[PDB]
From a paper:
In this context, the plant caseinolytic protease (Clp) complex plays an important role in degradation of accumulated and misfolded proteins in chloroplasts wherein the chaperones aid in ATP-dependent unfolding of protein substrates to be degraded by the associated protease machinery. The structured, mature forms of AtClpC1/C2/D consist of three distinct domains such as a short N-terminal domain (NTD) and two ATPase domains, a feature very similar to bacterial ClpC proteins. The N-terminal domain of [name] is known to perform the regulatory function of substrate recognition, either directly or indirectly through the adaptor proteins ClpS1/ClpF for which it becomes a binding platform161718, whereas no adaptor proteins have so far been reported for [name]. Here we report and analyse the crystal structures of AtClpC1 residues 94 to 238 and [name] residues 79 to 233 (hereafter mentioned as AtClpC1 NTD and [name] NTD respectively) that correspond to the ClpC NTD of eubacteria.
The 1.6 Å structure of [name] N-terminal domain (residues 79–233) revealed a α-helical structure, having 61% helical content. The domain is made up of seven helices: α1 (E85-L101), α2 (T106-E118), α3 (I132-D144), α4 (I170-M186), α5 (P191-V203), α6 (S207-L215) and α7 (M219-K231). The crystal structure included two molecules in an asymmetric unit. The crystal structure additionally shows the 26-residue long middle loop to take a different conformation compared to the 14-residue long loop of AtClpC1 NTD. Also, unlike in AtClpC1, the two halves of [name] NTD do not form the typical four-helix motif repeats. In [name], residues 122–128, which makes the short stretch corresponding to α3 of AtClpC1 NTD forms a loop instead of helix. The fact that there are helix breaker residues such as a Pro and two Gly within this stretch supports the experimental evidence for the presence of loop instead of a helix. The presence of longer middle loop and the absence of a helix in the stretch corresponding to α3 of AtClpC1 NTD make [name] NTD very different from any known Clp chaperone NTD structures and perhaps might attribute its functional significance of having to recognize specific substrates during stress conditions, without the involvement of any adaptor proteins. When the structure of [name] NTD is aligned with AtClpC1 NTD, we realize that the long middle loop comes directly over the region which may otherwise contribute to ClpS1 interaction. Therefore, [name] not binding to AtClpS1 or AtClpF could at least partly be due to the presence of the long middle loop in [name] NTD which would sterically prevent any such interaction.
Numbering used by the authors: 75 to 155, 160 to 232
Amino acid sequence: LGSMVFERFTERAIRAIIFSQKEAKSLGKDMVYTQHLLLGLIAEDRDPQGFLGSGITIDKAREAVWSIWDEANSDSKQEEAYSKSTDMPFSISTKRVFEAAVEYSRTMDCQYIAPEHIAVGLFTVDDGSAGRVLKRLGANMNLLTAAALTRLKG
């Protein structure tokens, strides 16, 4: 995407990002926080074995998210202050993740930022939101990070 901020992001990565916006909107949100990004990544991944081969699926992930943030008290950490769904802004935590993804990709001497780089970012530099969802799903976040790194090897 030439001389865009997302120029080096792959087609898959961009799709996951757009999906994060859609997922957030479905939940009645006006900004994409990191749990939403997690949803976008899950929605995007076409692995037949589920997200990062984990058996996680989007419907289950969506239930978890709704439950955690919407069925009881709201999250004090997510009150940061759009005419179509792809104009929905990203939270400071989410932006941090994207920056981490870029950094990791550069460190690895990769030409692109893939969803896997975003996942590594998500699972290393976020506000704890992704972890809460994974915990609810019974998943091990560090194993998922490893799986993402494994994918990037080919």
